[PDB]
Design an enzyme around this catalytic site. Structure first.
Site, PDB file in Angstrom:
ATOM      1  N   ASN A 120       0.807  -1.214   0.000  1.00  0.00           N
ATOM      2  CA  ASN A 120       0.000   0.000   0.000  1.00  0.00           C
ATOM      3  C   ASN A 120       0.844   1.269   0.000  1.00  0.00           C
ATOM      4  OD1 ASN A 120       0.987   0.129   2.645  1.00  0.00           O
ATOM      5  ND2 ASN A 120      -0.909  -0.712   3.516  1.00  0.00           N
ATOM      6  N   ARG A 271       1.459   7.001  11.262  1.00  0.00           N
ATOM      7  CA  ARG A 271       0.873   6.467  12.515  1.00  0.00           C
ATOM      8  C   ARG A 271       0.443   7.655  13.366  1.00  0.00           C
ATOM      9  NH1 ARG A 271      -0.706   2.994   9.982  1.00  0.00           N
ATOM     10  NH2 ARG A 271       0.003   0.849  10.290  1.00  0.00           N
ATOM     11  N   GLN A 299      -7.196   2.772  17.468  1.00  0.00           N
ATOM     12  CA  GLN A 299      -8.155   2.363  16.447  1.00  0.00           C
ATOM     13  C   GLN A 299      -8.877   1.114  16.925  1.00  0.00           C
ATOM     14  OE1 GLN A 299      -5.692   4.169  12.720  1.00  0.00           O
ATOM     15  NE2 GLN A 299      -6.266   1.999  12.629  1.00  0.00           N
ATOM     16  N   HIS A 325      -9.032   5.079   9.129  1.00  0.00           N
ATOM     17  CA  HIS A 325      -7.896   4.396   8.520  1.00  0.00           C
ATOM     18  C   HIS A 325      -8.343   3.538   7.345  1.00  0.00           C
ATOM     19  CE1 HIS A 325      -3.813   2.173   9.297  1.00  0.00           C
ATOM     20  NE2 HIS A 325      -3.787   2.961   8.237  1.00  0.00           N
TER      21      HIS A 325
HETATM   22  N1  LIG Z   1      -1.802   4.629   6.451  1.00  0.00           N
HETATM   23  C1  LIG Z   1      -1.600   3.393   6.004  1.00  0.00           C
HETATM   24  O1  LIG Z   1      -2.505   2.765   5.435  1.00  0.00           O
HETATM   25  C2  LIG Z   1      -0.268   2.821   6.199  1.00  0.00           C
HETATM   26  C3  LIG Z   1       0.608   3.531   6.942  1.00  0.00           C
HETATM   27  N2  LIG Z   1       1.902   3.146   7.031  1.00  0.00           N
HETATM   28  C4  LIG Z   1       2.727   3.594   8.157  1.00  0.00           C
HETATM   29  O2  LIG Z   1       3.698   4.505   7.676  1.00  0.00           O
HETATM   30  C5  LIG Z   1       5.031   3.980   7.861  1.00  0.00           C
HETATM   31  C6  LIG Z   1       5.834   4.246   6.611  1.00  0.00           C
HETATM   32  O3  LIG Z   1       6.498   3.028   6.212  1.00  0.00           O
HETATM   33  P1  LIG Z   1       7.010   2.820   4.730  1.00  0.00           P
HETATM   34  O4  LIG Z   1       7.351   4.113   4.088  1.00  0.00           O
HETATM   35  O5  LIG Z   1       5.958   1.972   4.013  1.00  0.00           O
HETATM   36  O6  LIG Z   1       8.299   1.899   4.903  1.00  0.00           O
HETATM   37  P2  LIG Z   1       9.854   2.114   5.165  1.00  0.00           P
HETATM   38  O7  LIG Z   1      10.582   0.826   5.154  1.00  0.00           O
HETATM   39  O8  LIG Z   1      10.348   3.131   4.137  1.00  0.00           O
HETATM   40  O9  LIG Z   1       9.876   2.775   6.606  1.00  0.00           O
HETATM   41  C7  LIG Z   1       9.696   4.196   6.784  1.00  0.00           C
HETATM   42  C8  LIG Z   1      11.013   4.909   6.590  1.00  0.00           C
HETATM   43  O10 LIG Z   1      10.965   6.204   7.230  1.00  0.00           O
HETATM   44  C9  LIG Z   1      12.246   6.534   7.751  1.00  0.00           C
HETATM   45  N3  LIG Z   1      12.120   6.762   9.191  1.00  0.00           N
HETATM   46  C10 LIG Z   1      12.039   5.815  10.177  1.00  0.00           C
HETATM   47  N4  LIG Z   1      11.921   6.308  11.387  1.00  0.00           N
HETATM   48  C11 LIG Z   1      11.942   7.676  11.186  1.00  0.00           C
HETATM   49  C12 LIG Z   1      11.852   8.773  12.070  1.00  0.00           C
HETATM   50  N5  LIG Z   1      11.734   8.647  13.396  1.00  0.00           N
HETATM   51  N6  LIG Z   1      11.896  10.015  11.541  1.00  0.00           N
HETATM   52  C13 LIG Z   1      12.017  10.146  10.217  1.00  0.00           C
HETATM   53  N7  LIG Z   1      12.106   9.193   9.286  1.00  0.00           N
HETATM   54  C14 LIG Z   1      12.065   7.977   9.834  1.00  0.00           C
HETATM   55  C15 LIG Z   1      13.199   5.398   7.364  1.00  0.00           C
HETATM   56  O11 LIG Z   1      13.837   5.706   6.129  1.00  0.00           O
HETATM   57  C16 LIG Z   1      12.231   4.225   7.199  1.00  0.00           C
HETATM   58  O12 LIG Z   1      12.756   3.220   6.341  1.00  0.00           O
HETATM   59  C17 LIG Z   1       4.856   2.501   8.209  1.00  0.00           C
HETATM   60  O13 LIG Z   1       5.879   2.040   9.085  1.00  0.00           O
HETATM   61  C18 LIG Z   1       3.475   2.462   8.874  1.00  0.00           C
HETATM   62  O14 LIG Z   1       3.563   2.715  10.271  1.00  0.00           O
HETATM   63  C19 LIG Z   1       2.434   2.349   6.063  1.00  0.00           C
HETATM   64  C20 LIG Z   1       1.647   1.548   5.362  1.00  0.00           C
HETATM   65  C21 LIG Z   1       0.166   1.613   5.418  1.00  0.00           C
END
Ligand SMILES: NC(=O)C1=CN([C@@H]2O[C@H](COP(=O)(O)OP(=O)(O)OC[C@H]3O[C@@H](n4cnc5c(N)ncnc54)[C@H](O)[C@@H]3O)[C@@H](O)[C@H]2O)C=CC1
Length: 372
Positions: A120, A271, A299, A325
């Site tokens: 997603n 999140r 949630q 969500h």
């Molecule tokens: N709203 C939705 O439907 C969904 C939401 N999400 C959420 O959003 C997050 C984004 O993950 P993705 O981009 O898919 O994977 P990803 O593997 O790219 O993880 C997020 C990236 O953000 C960076 N990051 C990590 N901690 C950080 C911090 N404290 N400050 C700044 N940058 C930081 C890193 O580069 C990390 O790899 C997920 O971990 C999940 O919690 C993701 C998928 C579905």
């Protein structure tokens, strides 16, 4: 009598009868029932995940070998709940985002935690952009004016801005954060800022700049900012695109919000606990920022949750773009993460264990990634 797969999804009700594509619901069970019963396991699927410890989910913990949750309606797998599942081995996320697990408690037990990474990332990127447009262009009052029968152009336009020539900044330049940056190029932003513990790949920087040059004749559109307080200070729009872990929880507090310009915008499709929820509502209600997004701190969200009645001083339909969500559970995304849970279960059942490296968050008692 048989080993149990315990699954918690959201209810479909009559919606599941009108849409077989609602795979991520209790009624349709991701379509894994045939695979689960083919390997001799019991499949139990419920939408009753709250309250602790009287829910159907709680009462199937003792025999739960596999627990499948989905972030849009997440069964929170806490320390207390882990302690009641003595034969738990695997936790699968029907989607992406495993904050609803106590990952350290699962690590102490040597529990494998698996997502469907990437299912997603584009679905969330679209939702972030959509939220950006809705807030900057004041779709709230513009749509309200149409619905309640009036024609007060000035009431809409007074808080209506173009995406163009605005400064956009992402906290996190991962799969999702970078995909938002891509979708912002053709809108011709003044600048694209980002903040991450790591640099953006060499080759990703050049891709963004290549599109800025092509579309808008501007070079050097992407730029790293190292101080979080600086990044938010220079931005008109900030996007949260990072996971929720202990150091990131609450990062968007009163101190950080108030270091942003009045009339700025905060987008959080990552999140909800990345923010101080009351500090967000206060800044929205005071008019300092506009806020939108689909992720909530707990949630399902309580009905008196402040974010549901947030609005800028201008009116009820100003500066508010909350949705439940849903971004990662679009019908197209559901087909992807349903298949990814099937791939994960097939690898586990057949004891091949040759999971995609990206899907693994925790395995054999160590966080097997920097995705927290
Ligand atoms: N709203 C939705 O439907 C969904 C939401 N999400 C959420 O959003 C997050 C984004 O993950 P993705 O981009 O898919 O994977 P990803 O593997 O790219 O993880 C997020 C990236 O953000 C960076 N990051 C990590 N901690 C950080 C911090 N404290 N400050 C700044 N940058 C930081 C890193 O580069 C990390 O790899 C997920 O971990 C999940 O919690 C993701 C998928 C579905």
């Amino acid at each position: 009598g048989k080993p149990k797969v315990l699954m918690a999804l959201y209810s479909g009700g009559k919606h599941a009868k009108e849409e077989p594509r609602l795979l991520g619901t209790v009624e349709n069970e991701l379509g894994i029932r045939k695979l689960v019963e083919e390997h001799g396991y019991e499949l139990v699927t419920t939408a009753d995940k709250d309250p602790f410890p009287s829910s159907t989910f709680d009462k199937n913990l003792p025999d739960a070998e596999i627990i499948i949750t989905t972030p849009f309606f997440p069964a929170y797998v806490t320390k207390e709940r882990i302690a009641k599942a003595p034969k738990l081995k695997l936790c699968v996320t029907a989607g992406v985002g495993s904050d609803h697990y106590d990952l350290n408690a699962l690590n102490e037990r040597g529990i494998a935690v698996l997502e469907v990474t990437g299912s997603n990332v584009q679905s969330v990127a679209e939702h972030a952009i959509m939220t950006m447009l809705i807030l900057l262009r004041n779709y709230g009052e513009g749509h309200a004016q149409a619905t309640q029968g009036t024609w007060d152009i000035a009431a809409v336009a007074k808080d209506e801005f173009d995406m163009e020539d605005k400064v956009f900044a992402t906290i996190g330049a991962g799969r999702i954060g970078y995909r938002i940056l891509e979708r912002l190029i053709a809108f011709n932003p003044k600048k694209l800022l980002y903040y991450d513990y790591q640099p953006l790949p060499e080759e990703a920087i050049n891709k963004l700049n290549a599109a800025s040059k092509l579309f808008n004749g501007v070079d050097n559109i992407i730029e790293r900012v190292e101080n979080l307080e600086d990044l938010v200070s220079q931005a008109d729009v900030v996007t949260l695109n990072c996971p929720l872990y202990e150091k990131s929880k609450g990062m968007f507090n009163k101190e950080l919000i108030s270091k942003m310009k009045k009339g700025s915008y905060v987008i959080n499709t990552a999140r909800g606990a990345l923010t101080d929820p009351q500090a967000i509502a206060d800044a929205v209600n005071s008019g300092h920022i506009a806020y939108g997004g689909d992720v909530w701190p707990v949630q399902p969200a309580p009905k008196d949750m402040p974010w549901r009645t947030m609005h800028n001083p201008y009116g009820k339909d100003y500066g508010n773009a909350m949705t439940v969500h849903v971004s990662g559970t679009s019908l197209d995304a559901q087909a992807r993460y349903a298949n990814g849970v099937k791939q994960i279960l097939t690898e586990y059942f057949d004891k091949t264990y040759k999971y995609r490296p990206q899907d693994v968050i925790c395995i054999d008692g160590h966080y097997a990634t920097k995705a927290y």
